Amino acid sequence: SGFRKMAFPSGKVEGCMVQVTCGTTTLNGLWLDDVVYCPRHVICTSEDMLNPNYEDLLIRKSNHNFLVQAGNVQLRVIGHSMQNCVLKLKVDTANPKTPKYKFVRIQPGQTFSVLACYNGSPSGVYQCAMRPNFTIKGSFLNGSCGSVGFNIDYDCVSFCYMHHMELPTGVHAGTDLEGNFYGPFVDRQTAQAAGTDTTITVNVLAWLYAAVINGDRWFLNRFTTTLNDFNLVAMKYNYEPLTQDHVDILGPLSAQTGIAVLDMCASLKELLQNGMNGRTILGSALLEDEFTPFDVVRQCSGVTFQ
Amino acid sequence: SGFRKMAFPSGKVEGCMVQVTCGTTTLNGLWLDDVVYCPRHVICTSEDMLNPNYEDLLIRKSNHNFLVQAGNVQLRVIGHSMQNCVLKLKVDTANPKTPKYKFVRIQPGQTFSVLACYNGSPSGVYQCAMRPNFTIKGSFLNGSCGSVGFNIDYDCVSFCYMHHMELPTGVHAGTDLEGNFYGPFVDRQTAQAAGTDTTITVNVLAWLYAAVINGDRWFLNRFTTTLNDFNLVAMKYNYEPLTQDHVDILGPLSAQTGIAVLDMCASLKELLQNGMNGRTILGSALLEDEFTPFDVVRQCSGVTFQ
């Protein structure tokens, strides 16, 4: 029993983190086979970041400008190339700790683990979700750029996020590992807005099923509702629309608990229109939306990794 | 910016986890040098656990009764001994991934990372606190016994918890790594009660400082209070007493923000007597108490590990 915000074990990623220094910028790189991936703004100083031109800046660089530290060992850079907003530093040594991996781009609403790093050394691991507005509510300080987000399925690491920047609400923006930003953000210290966010409805329902599995049942009710009547209440409270696909995905959770999906929608409708009245659900006084249906099943069935 | 419930990177612990099978019990073991540590109830079947006598049970066992798997490799057990509620299985191979480590016992209110494991394979990592009543609000399913909790300081792993059992409120009990239970619990499937819990006051104040550091400031007020007047309100709301030591520990956070500790106590007093009125603090609608002063500084200054 119990329900926690749970990250993947980080060992396979820890062995890939390195420090990239060029000029007076230091950040983290991801070392897979004989390539180190890092944010391209490592070739920018503090006066560059205001309006930079990265193709000009990179032809001016040489391999020896890039100081890569793997632990205490120097990695010799023997080539470099930019891919969208990431740099690929070609090194002469393949990482012997390279796990099986894939570069995947995730959808808003999906979750992943972040291994926060400074100077190529991991600091902590935590879980979060890609928001509907393509930001993530992370925990990042100066020097954390190049930290990555990832999922693990059995033995394979699916890297989905590399950290680039903080926006003026304290939320974070970055790219997939092919260097393409999530959302309408650019790696320039220009005024950029997150955009209006919404609550991930299918995740809230998953979390309500997790609660029922763990014995929180007070919010359940006799009622029911149609998918269109629910979505009318959803759009009133700034919740994402629920699709038949979302209902299908919640099927197994509905089966385990014996609560039809639309019945759980009726409970969520009441929670939205009435609040919680000082009750809590899984130790929260808010409706939580950073757990996917898969996260819930995973945690409440005990899937492992290696 | 941002504030997350952050665990330590788990790599150093992942390399120590193994599977221990004896009879028809399978659980996790911790392999350090040439010893595997695991809960002593691995020598109990399902009918034993109701009222067992572990000294009798263990003289009946032989080394070859214990099947230890490290990955796919068999570890030969060459000796065994019980220490309080843990078994020490002596194996013929020293773990070449053994990190620098210590066995430490923590205090209620202190936090640690749990690496949840099944069949010797890590499933997830999350952070929690030792409650005042010596339980932890974990996330554990059948087969998770022997998973450990730990902190990391630079390169050294301080193991503080090994999981043994779930109590009839969904909370969890276990031992330090010398086999001594936290709290008045025994490794017998007898009726056991958690005992009345309280809120960790010094941690709530730390989290309020984290909020101020991150720009949540609405709960701040002109007021102030004495340490004894605060503790009068504390005991009314089932909060632990605050000591001068707690005030001292919060000193650095008080210095960074320029809010005196007793001034923050005055804010907490108002939050207790008035609630939050639909406001949130660091994305929570509840006063959070599983972040220590050290957790806050760590996260808001970016200390790393290796």
Ligand SMILES: *[C@H](O)[C@H](C[C@@H]1CCNC1=O)NC(=O)[C@H](CC1CC1)NC(=O)[C@@H](NC(=O)OCc1ccccc1)C(C)(C)C
């Ligand atoms: C890399 O280690 C850091 C990590 C960053 C610092 C604090 N928290 C973080 O996550 N990233 C950077 O320094 C960024 C580099 C720029 C992309 C090339 N810069 C920023 O994150 C930057 N934010 C920013 O400029 O965008 C939003 C904005 C700018 C101007 C006006 C309005 C909004 C800050 C200001 C955080 C350093």
Ligand SMILES: *[C@H](O)[C@H](C[C@@H]1CCNC1=O)NC(=O)[C@H](CC1CC1)NC(=O)[C@@H](NC(=O)OCc1ccccc1)C(C)(C)C
């Ligand atoms: C080991 O893998 C498991 C992990 C446990 C199962 C579900 N969640 C968990 O954390 N531990 C055990 O099976 C325990 C072994 C006993 C200590 C030797 N047993 C339990 O956790 C057990 N709880 C229990 O018996 O104590 C509370 C109690 C018992 C009877 C009446 C009232 C209260 C359960 C019932 C959870 C299996």
